[PDB]
Structures are given as structure tokens and as C-alpha cells.
């Protein structure tokens, strides 16, 4: 169903994204109301909605008139702030942000991650091949959920025994498998992660291993060590960041291939590069739909004024569908060039795990390309529920194997 009128659309309600096709809604916003004021709903204030690609990157990079320090997503932005302000990278601006980023960039750069990228390829292939042999399976549970989290946990140094439990917490933190979920369950789930990492960071401060937590525990910003609080809070943003969005990207690539078999064939027969395909997968599945800022001063955009203290929401999914930037936006085209999408954001806060995000998608595409002829949906998939994220909980598929290629892998 494709809604026609702007006024009766509540972007804060997760139900909106389940039971509506918002393509016309965003098109109308892009064309006639590029800066739109969403009304207040209940206690939540109203907020600006930005839908044009040009505007979206313009404000992504203006960390001078706009700030992440009072929330960067709706659940904190509408609440009036974020507890982790000035401590968690995502909700920190200024010199503390610059320093804390340069500390983390030392273990998330392409240089540092090359040992890990090899391990992703290995683990990814195994999971894909074993799902091909099985034929019928759930791709989300049996393949997708198994890579992003395990990769970040290998990096952070989370013991294997605990990962299954952390996975359960992430599924309730900002998204939900249950359509009717209260803010309380979300609150508890988020806080149980902090509780877990309080204890783990404690162990590593006393007995340091070689992992990424230990690197943070041995690092300094402006000549002073990091608080156990600061480290814990960034471990949260890494365990959650390194998981959901990549997971949802991978699942969506498969679901999109069943709908677009012409494109699947281009990949399978090596008529398009993995580099080029990965980017379209990312543009297509824009898992994080929105991110946001607060105004610190007054701004003039499109002849309207954003007052200091107003929430500004930037809509990645709309920006990735802007006709003025992408020729035939709603075409899934693996050869799309140029493909300067904004799935990873833009500017100072550009996604830390961008290289790792691509890596995980890149690997999946390489594995599917080699050891699979095609696949088919065997029963209706379940969506997650969120006003921030978009993707699938489970995806039942039948995977048609490449017996020739699979047999050679057994060596």
C-alpha cells in the first residue's frame, strides 16, 4: 500500500514501516517539502525531516551548527538527550571526538583489519557451503547472524560462551522481533549490555590480553587514560554497531536477489565485480534508515529557520533514492556507477566500521557467487520492528548448490 498524504504519517511509530510503502511519501517530501516539520506525538516534540541527498550530506558534515551530543537517533533525540554524551564516540563532538576516534582508527583501519578480513572469508564460506548442502534452511539464523557479531566479538575479545546471549540482547536494543514491544524491554536490553561489559572491561583492566578492549584500556586521549565508563560505553556501540546493520545488509542482499534474478546472474557469471555489487547492496538495503542531530545555533535552509535546540533527522533511505543523484533510483543495478550512496553517513562521524561492513558483505557475495547456482524463498519472512532500523528477523530459503565447486573446496 502506497500512502498519498503527508500529514497522517508517524515516523516515530515502527508500525508505519511495516504496513506502508513510503516511496511516494519520500518522493513528495524530496520534491515539495525538502525541509519538513514532523508534528509532536504524545510527549515527544516535533522534529525536522530532511529527505534530499544534497541536504542530508550537507548537514551530516556540519558538526558546528549541529551536534550529536544530545542524541543521534530518535529514541534519545526525542527523550531530550543521551546519557553517553561526550563519552560514546557516536554522541561526542569536538576534540574529545577527534581523539577517541584516532584511538579506535588504529584497530579499525584497512591496515589493521587485514588479518580479520581473511578469517571472515573462511568462516563465511563454511557457513554458506553447509547451508547449500542442507538446501532448505533459514538464512538469517543459519548464516547471517553467525558472522557480523562473531567478527566484532573476536576483535573486542568477548569469550565465545557469551556471544549467543549478547545476540539476544541486540535483537531487543533498538529493533524488536515483537511488533508490540515496550520501551522498558528496550531499556533493560540496552542496560544488560552495559552490565555485561562492566564486568568484562574490569577483567581486562586487571589482566590485559591482546584484544581491542585491551588496546582501549592501554590508550590515552590528551595525555590521560580512558575511564572504565568511556571504554564500556564504546564497547556497547561496537557490539551493537558491528552486528545489526551488517547482518540486515546480508539478509537483504539474498531477499533482493530472488526478486531480481537478472542481477543475481550477473554476479554469479562474473559479469560484475564484487566491489561494484557490494555498493549496490548497501545503497539498496539502507539498514539504518535515519540518523539525527540537534541545532546549537539558528540555521537558514530552504528559506525556513531551524531554531537552536530543534531535532534534525537525516533520512538515509530517502537520500539513497534521490532521483537528482541516482538515475532510476529504484532499480537494483549491480553495475550502478557512480554509486556514492550515504549508507555509511558522511563527514566527521562517517561510519567507523565502514571497511569492516563492506568486508562482511563482500565476502558473502563472493561465497554465494562461487558455491551457489540460485535460491528461492520457502515461506514468508519476518520483518524486524523499528523506526531506526529496517530488515528481516528470519528468511526461509532453499539454496541450490554448486556441487562442482563445492567438491573442490573439500581438499
Amino acid at each position: 500500500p502506497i500512502p498519498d498524504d503527508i500529514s497522517t504519517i508517524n515516523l516515530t511509530d515502527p508500525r508505519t514501516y511495516e504496513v506502508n510503502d513510503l516511496s511516494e511519501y519520500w518522493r513528495q517530501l524530496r520534491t515539495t517539502r525538502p525541509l519538513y516539520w514532523h508534528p509532536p506525538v504524545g510527549d515527544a516534540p516535533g522534529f525536522w525531516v530532511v529527505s534530499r541527498y544534497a541536504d542530508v550530506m550537507a548537514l551530516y558534515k556540519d558538526n558546528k551548527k549541529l551536534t550529536s551530543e544530545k542524541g543521534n537517533v530518535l529514541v534519545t533525540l526525542l527523550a531530550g538527550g543521551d546519557s553517553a554524551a561526550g563519552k560514546m564516540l557516536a554522541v561526542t563532538d569536538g576534540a574529545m571526538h577527534r581523539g577517541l576516534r584516532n584511538v579506535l582508527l588504529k584497530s579499525f583501519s584497512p591496515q589493521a583489519l587485514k588479518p580479520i578480513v581473511d578469517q571472515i572469508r573462511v568462516n563465511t564460506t563454511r557457513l554458506v557451503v553447509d547451508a547449500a548442502r542442507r538446501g532448505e534452511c533459514d538464512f538469517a539464523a543459519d548464516v547471517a547472524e553467525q558472522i557480523p557479531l562473531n567478527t566484532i566479538s573476536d576483535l573486542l575479545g568477548v569469550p565465545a560462551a557469551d556471544r549467543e546471549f549478547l545476540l539476544k540482547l541486540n535483537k531487543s536494543a533498538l529493533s524488536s522481533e515483537d511488533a508490540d514491544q515496550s520501551a522498558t524491554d528496550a531499556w533493560l536490553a540496552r542496560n544488560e549490555i552495559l552490565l555485561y561489559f562492566s564486568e568484562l572491561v574490569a577483567e581486562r583492566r586487571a589482566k590485559p590480553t591482546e584484544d581491542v578492549i585491551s588496546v582501549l584500556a592501554n590508550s590515552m586521549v590528551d595525555g590521560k587514560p580512558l575511564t572504565e565508563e568511556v571504554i564500556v560505553l564504546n564497547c556497547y556501540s561496537l557490539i551493537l554497531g558491528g552486528d545489526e546493520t551488517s547482518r540486515l545488509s546480508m539478509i537483504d542482499s539474498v531477499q533482493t536477489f530472488t526478486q531480481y534474478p537478472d542481477q543475481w546472474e550477473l554476479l554469479r557469471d562474473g559479469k560484475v565485480t564484487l566491489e561494484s555489487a557490494t555498493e549496490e547492496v548497501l545503497r539498496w538495503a539502507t539498514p539504518a534508515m535515519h540518523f539525527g542531530r540537534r541545532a546549537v545555533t539558528d540555521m537558514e535552509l530552504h528559506g525556513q529557520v531551524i531554531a537552536a535546540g530543534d531535532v534534525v533527522t537525516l533520512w538515509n533511505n530517502s537520500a539513497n533514492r534521490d532521483e537528482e543523484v541516482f538515475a532510476d533510483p529504484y532499480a537494483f543495478d549491480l553495475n550502478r556507477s557512480p554509486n556514492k550512496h550515504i549508507t555509511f553517513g558522511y563527514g566527521p562521524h562517517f561510519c567507523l566500521g565502514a571497511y569492516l561492513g563492506r568486508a562482511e558483505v563482500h565476502a558473502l557475495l563472493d561465497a554465494l557467487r562461487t558455491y551457489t547456482t540460485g535460491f528461492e524463498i520457502t515461506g514468508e519472512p519476518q520483518r524486524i520492528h523499528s523506526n531506526f532500523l529496517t530488515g528481516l528477523s528470519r528468511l526461509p530459503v532453499r539454496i541450490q548448490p554448486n556441487e562442482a565447486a563445492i567438491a573442490a573446496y573439500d581438499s
Binding site: 546519557s83 531499556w187 533493560l188 542496560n191 552495559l194 564500556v232
Partner: protein
């Protein structure tokens, strides 16, 4: 109001330490005193260790006051 237990007294000291405050009401809500997430984490993890009792976070959310937490640690 004054604390009435070793427990209430000790719990109130933990509240004061965590909320970076003093003279914290014994029946005051933890959130209404301006209580946020990482505070609550430090709070719950300390109560768990000092009283050697497994305190589920959910039960803390229901009864987030010095008075109520005392009863729960007891019963």
C-alpha cells in the same frame, strides 16, 4: 526521612555515591532524582557484589528506591 536498617543506610550511601549527591530521599525514585543508564549500571553491579545477592535488573526497574530495594534484598 531517616534510614531504619543497616541495609537502608548502606543502600542510601550507594545511591549518594552513584548519583554524585548527598541527602538522598529513602523513598525517592532513582530516575526522578535524575538517574540515567550508566549510573544505574554502576548502582546495580555494586549492590550485587556488596550484598552477595543476584539482583535481576528488571526487579530494580520496578522498585528503583532505597526503601524498596532493602525489602527485596531481605525477602
Amino acid at each position: 526521612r531517616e534510614p531504619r536498617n543497616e541495609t537502608e543506610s548502606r543502600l542510601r550511601r550507594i545511591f549518594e555515591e552513584v548519583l554524585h549527591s548527598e541527602d538522598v530521599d529513602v523513598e525517592a525514585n532513582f530516575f526522578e532524582l535524575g538517574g540515567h543508564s550508566l549510573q544505574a549500571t554502576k548502582l546495580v553491579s555494586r549492590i550485587r557484589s556488596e550484598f552477595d545477592a543476584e539482583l535481576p535488573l528488571r526487579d530494580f526497574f520496578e522498585h528503583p528506591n532505597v526503601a524498596g530495594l532493602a525489602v527485596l534484598i531481605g525477602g
